[PDB]
Design an enzyme around this catalytic site. Structure first.
Site, PDB file in Angstrom:
ATOM      1  N   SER A 105       0.852  -1.190   0.000  1.00 16.77           N
ATOM      2  CA  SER A 105       0.000   0.000   0.000  1.00 16.77           C
ATOM      3  C   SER A 105       0.871   1.216   0.000  1.00 16.77           C
ATOM      4  O   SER A 105       1.978   1.198   0.559  1.00 16.77           O
ATOM      5  CB  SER A 105      -0.909   0.067   1.242  1.00 16.77           C
ATOM      6  OG  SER A 105      -1.673   1.294   1.284  1.00 16.77           O
TER       7      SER A 105
ATOM      8  N   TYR B  13      -1.823  -0.798   9.983  1.00 15.20           N
ATOM      9  CA  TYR B  13      -1.826  -1.284   8.602  1.00 15.20           C
ATOM     10  C   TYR B  13      -0.615  -0.737   7.847  1.00 15.20           C
ATOM     11  O   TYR B  13       0.051  -1.472   7.101  1.00 15.20           O
ATOM     12  CB  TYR B  13      -3.123  -0.860   7.908  1.00 15.20           C
ATOM     13  CG  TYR B  13      -3.210  -1.141   6.440  1.00 15.20           C
ATOM     14  CD1 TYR B  13      -3.540  -2.424   5.961  1.00 15.20           C
ATOM     15  CD2 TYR B  13      -2.986  -0.136   5.511  1.00 15.20           C
ATOM     16  CE1 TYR B  13      -3.638  -2.677   4.597  1.00 15.20           C
ATOM     17  CE2 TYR B  13      -3.096  -0.386   4.144  1.00 15.20           C
ATOM     18  CZ  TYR B  13      -3.437  -1.639   3.703  1.00 15.20           C
ATOM     19  OH  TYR B  13      -3.550  -1.894   2.353  1.00 15.20           O
TER      20      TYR B  13
END
Lengths: 237, 237, 237, 237
Positions: free
Chosen positions: B145, B159
């Site tokens: 990401s 995350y």
């Protein structure tokens, strides 16, 4: 009438530039082939473009010279009636040495070609491809190097810096041109055949074609959400 | 007899995983579709794989559980008689908040799924794809990401860290497995549709398909000198 | 009454942690010395803190265990009547090998200590130092590694990932806690003495003290606009 | 006789350069103060150096001009009888705009000052500080910018590239000069006072002094294992 898009490639007479030209033709593009001095090599690239089914337009010019850059773009636009993309690839050949030994003329040539030249060509693509300046959108791919993150100590630390500039250009210009229909990415090739290659994880130097594949992907529509990327093609180094 | 290569995709029931499965099928792959709980969604992905011309094998399992991971790989190998690739995509859903408010159970789930799970699956691919361990070579793509470089403050900084681990895994494992015929890369998606998207340079959220394109390119043979790369697919953010 | 600020250092019984404790004391701090098992080494660090003019508080605990982490912080706060900083340094010792050979128990220990533990301690510092949660502001330094960018192939690619997570934590938490009076940075040490060191540009392994200097600088007030930084201390590698 | 070390700072008449000069003096250095045009401001910096207890040597020169750079270094060496360090800080002032609007003269000035100039000064430091070329060792700090990673879209994407080059220079030259007793690092300042500053995590623009602190640390002996580092001083942005 032609549904082929047009890409101007700088330093397209040999190596990565040539492979990109030929591959882009195989994948449906017409190609402007810029070169500095080696016109015979450029003509061989053009014949390979034509053989692959593309139109080819050969165009001499120093990317460091504003007038040459404007003429290069004007010429391709004349030939094909359109411009859709730029691959910034022109470079110089220089000998391996530490910074302390490099003469100023070599430094100037390195930066004028790899930094100023990349900016002038990117600037022209910005002027011509941006939807807010009358263009139809498109893509730019800058050819950088893994040298930008490794530094090429005792060899080409000036080249390393020049590609650090290209990486930063890529990031900023992607942001700048995103709202105007133009993606901007870079490939960072490693050792590419024209014994360090043998010391990379894949155990060999890369082929120019292998870099061309990465370039042509970033130019195409399947890369539509990909902009500002720096794509290493260096065998794991 | 089948000249189609086989890819195991984790978290393939929805979103990026599903799009990758379907696109890989369109591009000539058979697909193992791993899921955690949503078996109906996995079956819909399988039907889409089959409709695109691929064989599909659905396989439940927690990527954080060693026994599930070994069974997942064993199952795909049983079905297709071969394994050529892994896409590490499984994730979790968690609410947006600062680290200070996150409960420990959420942290554990995030890391067990995104870090330990990615390592166990990559480890299994290493065991099964590496030419020095009897495999035929192949490719791994990790889904990371842009959060790894941006940090997802006040939202998902756990995350973010997990994907920082995935980026580092990618770099190291690429080096480690290069001599054994296995490329390892990552895509770093940005905002991907399932109003921040509107604030990115391309002015929209990305489509899952757009990430799938990047994944499937990195899995294929035209990416042959590309390993250790981190490929942002985030619209310029 | 004491005008000395208090820093809790995890894994402070040996090496970088110990040097940081001693140096912080020399520079005007009181120190909480956390350790996992080696209480004798922790006591030697405490005596060195006291000899340098600081108060020392020794505190056992597994950074991966929420109850231990809350008790660690509670204890230091009890001892000194205040908390101003955290150094995240606890790690594990593991043997060198490729990912394919690593057992799952080793992977879990690596991630629980270096990822979950760093998050739980950072979370506690966030709760206790943030001005919006009653604290007086402060600083966190995370000890990462150059392994986060190099990957430690064939050695510790799990450790590499764990420090990639720490780098991302640093970036995100810096953003998250900036408005609440807390700076968050990381040092990324290279080879640090407890023959690769000889192959680094400075031609030697680093000393623990040399990393401690970087840590203590990032903890102090002259680093007031420095947050979100990743400070390599690796001899040029 | 003097036990003070000597540092040549480029663009030292104002801002970060001035603060660094004054702080270096407070911390025991003598200072060469280079400037391009504002001699009165340079003289004020010199008086501040002298007031802090340092010797000051003012020296005009264009960092892009080889003869000026050689004279600058020669002059400082004449004055103090020694050279121990360089801070590369000279820059230009340019208006905010997209690349498409930038004239070529502005581009040339940006690159000649920030890229060629930084290389010529670093080259001279390499010649004079390296132990293999007769020098006594030392340190170089390059002043870069967070713009190198953010890109300064619609403002200074040329400046952004120039600092990308400086980051790469830093990495490569650190490796190159490590065996010869010279550390090379960079600071990457964010928004520094001479309303975006208000949008950074620390909620304000930085002070020049705050960058100077980072510079002077990297110049000093407590940074002895720190080389090749890129130290963000940008308030979390």
């Amino acid at each position: 009438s032609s549904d082929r898009k047009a890409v101007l490639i700088t330093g397209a007479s040999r190596g990565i530039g040539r492979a990109t030209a030929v591959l882009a033709a195989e994948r449906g593009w017409d190609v402007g082939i810029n070169y500095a001095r080696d016109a015979a090599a450029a003509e061989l690239t053009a014949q390979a473009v034509r053989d692959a089914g593309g139109r080819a337009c050969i165009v001499a010019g120093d990317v460091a010279n504003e007038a040459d850059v404007v003429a290069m773009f004007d010429t391709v636009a004349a030939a094909f009636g359109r411009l859709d993309a730029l691959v910034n690839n022109a470079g110089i050949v220089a000998p391996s040495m530490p910074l302390a030994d490099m003469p100023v003329d070599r430094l100037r040539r390195m930066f004028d070609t790899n930094v100023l030249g990349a900016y002038l060509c990117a600037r022209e693509a910005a002027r011509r491809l941006s939807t807010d300046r009358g263009g139809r959108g498109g893509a730019i791919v800058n050819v950088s190097s893994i040298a930008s993150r490794l530094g090429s100590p005792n060899e080409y630390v000036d080249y390393a810096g020049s590609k650090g500039a290209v990486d930063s250009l890529t990031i900023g210009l992607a942001k700048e041109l995103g709202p105007h229909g133009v993606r901007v990415n870079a490939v960072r090739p490693g050792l590419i055949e024209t014994r360090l290659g043998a010391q990379t994880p894949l155990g060999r130097a890369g082929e120019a074609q292998e870099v061309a594949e990465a370039i042509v992907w970033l130019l195409g529509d399947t890369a539509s959400y990909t902009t500002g990327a720096l794509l290493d093609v260096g065998g794991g180094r």
